Every structure is written in C-alpha cells, then in structure tokens.
C-alpha cells in the first residue's frame with residue numbers, strides 16, 4: 663500500500679527533492695552494486711560514509727545516517743547499516759532484514775521530529791523529500807526482495823517508498 667514501483671535507473675536525474683535509501687556495510691566500502699555507483703557520482707558523500715564507519719564501525723548496525731550528495735541539493739543519501747561486512751562476507755539474511763527494519767524506524771522517527779552531516783547542506787524541510795530506493799538487500803546481500811518488501815510495508819501509514827526496479 664505504501665510502495666510505488668518504478669522501473670528505471672534510480673540515478674537518472676530528477677527535478678524533485680528525494681532521499682536515496684540504500685543498504686550499507688559498516689566496513690567503509692561502497693564497493694559494488696548501487697553503492698559503487700554512488701561512490702563514483704558522490705565522492706564527498708562517500709567520504710562522510712567512510713568517516714562514520716571509522717568512528718562507529720559495526721556499532722552502526724540498525725542505524726541510518728543521512729548524507730548530502732553535495733553534487734545535488736535535491737538529493738540526500740540515506741545509508742542503512744545492515745551488515746558488518748560487504749560482498750560475500752555479508753551477514754545472515756535474517757540479520758540484514760532486522761537491521762533494515764531498525765534503520766528505517768530511525769529514519770521514520772527523524773522525519774517526524776542521523777542528521778549531523780545535513781547541517782548546512784539540506785535545502786528543504788526533511789518531510790519534503792520523497793523516499794526512493796533500489797531493491798535493497800536483493801543484490802550483493804542476497805535477500806529475496808519480497809522479504810524486504812514486508813519490512814517496507816510495515817511502515818504503511820508513516821512512510822511511502824518509490825522502489826526502482828531495473
């Protein structure tokens with residue numbers, strides 16, 4: 663009910679403000695998949711992500727951080743920390759699903775009021791940003807999308823998501 667599916671590339675530019683949500687490891691590696699593409703296009707955001715990983719490490723599991731893209735004042739990046747390591751070393755799919763839930767709940771709480779890096783680089787009220795994501799967890803982390811979907815649909819009534827399908 664709160665999910666809208668779009669087929670297309672989430673990184674094609676849009677004219678409206680949005681938060682790009684994606685699933686992250688705590689090892690400072692935007693190393694593959696969508697994270698690699700964000701690293702190529704938003705290197706200052708990658709720097710912030712790496713600094714947060716250096717400061718907190720796997721203590722970040724279940725949290726999210728909102729980062730400026732810096733290249734586009736219409737785009738913020740929301741990192742959901744759902745696994746200690748990336749690539750083949752990722753956590754158990756049950757763990758990733760539960761940290762996704764916990765991280766999205768912190769984002770929900772923030773919008774209703776994570777934002778330390780936004781100070782000075784957020785253009786609009788946080789509620790004005792659309793929440794968009796690829797099919798997170800379903801690639802390098804291997805979690806069947808339908809399981810993450812149930813996590814997304816639990817936030818029905820508080821948050822609406824646009825999910826890009828390639």
Ligand SMILES: Nc1ncnc2c1ncn2[C@@H]1O[C@H](COP(=O)(O)OP(=O)(O)OC[C@H]2O[C@@H](O)[C@H](O)[C@@H]2O)[C@@H](O)[C@H]1O
Nearest residue numbers: 671672685687693695696697748796798799800801802803
């Ligand atoms: N521009 C893109 N646009 C839309 N969808 C995309 C795009 N790039 C990838 N996708 C799709 O997004 C889904 C998830 O992408 P992954 O990168 O594999 O993310 P995830 O499964 O959640 O694993 C996260 C892990 O990999 C890295 O992204 C990250 O560093 C983390 O360690 C896959 O179906 C993938 O094909």
